[PDB]
Design a protein around this ligand. Structure first.
Ligand SMILES: C[S@@+](CC[C@H](N)C(=O)[O-])C[C@H]1O[C@@H](n2cnc3c(N)ncnc32)[C@H](O)[C@@H]1O
Ligand SMILES: [As]
Ligand SMILES: [As]
Length: 465
């Protein structure tokens, strides 16, 4: 049994160290992982009660270490799972939550823990603070007298990140942009488990006794769905942390502000609106897309204002004007090839993508004028500015290119928008399956809206004198 585990581990490391069809490669590492997982005992450490039985002990511990515990409670919400609910009215500008640095789990708490000796010797742990935090969480989970036990015992036992999807759930993402990041996440997590199973030279860790794949998947998913950035002890730069109490807050586009109080050395949340008793207390996780939310947080946000789909574009080395185009882009601080995004909102493109498309479609004479800088206007500075077109001709060409490109990308999809919406009527679809389908539907709705915006712009510029 232990010799067999290490044998399958070595094969997993090799299988995940070769680059790449993508789906075929994914099912291979998936059948390999599900085999190693079958031979293991799930999570090495489990707790006697359900997570909700442990919330009073999390509150007591946070309270004893100086955190704000009054005016809220933990409630199981239908749409977001567990979260915080106000027990009284909260007024705008009220400093509602504060969590002292002592409660946090950081790379700094990791280095000072039983994990320090292995952290000091391992190069992978040194370059990836999130993986180091994942291991710090694992080591402490398995230490019964750990200071962080009231926090670890209230953490979820599973997540809705793609690492937890069944093959049939991921299948729904075939022929989408998002599926590429899902494969990469699966291939990197498996590679990481393999490397670290072999490495696990500090044997004083409770991971020497038991370190399953389910342990690693739980640790990295706990970190990616909950990690927040905090400043360092001196305030020089940003670092990652797991913040107890605070990380019970779900996401909404709400009237709250979060920050770090350097002087009092604590994580702070200020209400920017009055909240009524019995209302859920949320925080803003950031202007993340639904792809970033599904893949790194395990949820799809329906009311996402910031939804977008990734798009790769580059100037062709076979274009006669490649060198001039590349130079104008470099002077504007834009690469010759990169991953851009198409936004659901009007305008679908950023100042950086507008700048790129204008250069991509410039004539030789326009390129020369930009490189000479003999305009009364700094044309490099206004390159991504909608108010300063290079020419109506350039605008017509770039909006034509975008319309055509988005139309082409749309055809690469296996299902229609109506088919996605019909599928979504199945009340028995799993949470994970609904997330994959909404994501697939979302990509198409963004591309369809981008075709329409590009046509409106093409028409507008073809109407100019
Ligand atoms: C930082 S924790 C928030 C507390 C989490 N609900 C729990 O029970 O521990 C983040 C997790 O909450 C969920 N979540 C947060 N906001 C959400 C939302 N608006 N809709 C659905 N799920 C949400 C996802 O499972 C996410 O991975
Ligand atoms: As904070
Ligand atoms: As708050």
């Amino acid at each position: 049994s232990p010799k067999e585990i290490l044998n399958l581990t070595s094969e997993l490391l090799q299988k995940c160290s070769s680059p790449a069809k993508e789906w075929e490669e994914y099912v291979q590492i998936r059948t390999l992982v599900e085999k190693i997982r079958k031979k293991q005992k799930g999570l090495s450490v489990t707790f006697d009660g359900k997570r909700e039985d442990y919330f009073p002990d999390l509150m007591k511990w946070a309270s004893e270490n100086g955190a704000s515990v009054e005016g809220f409670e933990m409630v199981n919400f239908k749409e977001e799972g567990f979260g915080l609910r106000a027990t009284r009215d909260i007024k705008a500008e009220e400093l509602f939550l504060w969590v002292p640095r002592k409660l946090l789990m950081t790379v700094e708490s990791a280095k000072n823990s039983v994990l320090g000796p292995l952290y000091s010797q391992d190069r992978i742990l040194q370059a990836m603070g999130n993986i180091a935090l994942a291991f710090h969480l694992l080591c402490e989970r398995a230490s019964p007298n750990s200071f962080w036990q009231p926090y670890i015992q209230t953490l979820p036992s599973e997540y809705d990140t793609p690492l937890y999807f069944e093959e049939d759930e991921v299948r729904y993402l075939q022929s989408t942009q998002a599926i590429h990041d899902v494969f990469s996440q699966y291939k990197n997590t498996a590679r990481q488990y393999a490397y670290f199973y072999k490495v696990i030279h500090a044997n004083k860790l409770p991971l020497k006794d038991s370190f399953t794949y389910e342990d690693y998947r739980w640790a990295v998913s706990s970190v990616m769905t909950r990690q927040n950035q905090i400043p360092t002890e001196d305030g020089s730069r940003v670092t990652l942390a797991l913040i107890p109490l605070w990380d019970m807050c779900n996401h909404t586009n709400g009237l709250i502000t979060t920050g770090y109080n350097l002087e009092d050395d604590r994580c702070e949340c200020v209400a920017l609106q009055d909240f009524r008793a019995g209302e859920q207390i949320y925080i803003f996780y950031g202007t993340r897309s639904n792809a970033e939310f599904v893949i790194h947080s395990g949820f799809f946000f329906d009311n996402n204002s910031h939804d977008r789909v990734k798009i790769k574009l580059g100037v062709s080395k076979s274009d006669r004007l490649y060198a001039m185009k590349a130079e104008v882009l470099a002077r504007a601080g834009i690469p010759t090839s990169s991953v851009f995004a198409l936004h659901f909102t009007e305008p679908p493109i950023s100042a950086q993508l507008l700048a790129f498309l204008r250069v991509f479609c410039m004539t030789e004479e326009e390129l020369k004028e930009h490189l000479l800088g003999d305009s009364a206007i700094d044309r490099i500075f206004t390159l991504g500015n909608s108010e300063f077109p290079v020419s109506w001709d350039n605008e017509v060409k770039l909006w034509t290119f975008l319309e055509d490109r988005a139309s082409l990308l749309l055809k690469t999809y296996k299902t229609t928008i109506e088919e996605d919406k019909s599928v979504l009527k199945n009340h028995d679809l799993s949470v994970r399956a609904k997330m994959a389908i909404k994501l697939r539907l979302g990509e198409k709705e963004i591309l369809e809206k981008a075709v329409k915006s590009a046509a409106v712009n093409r028409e507008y510029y073809r109407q100019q004198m």
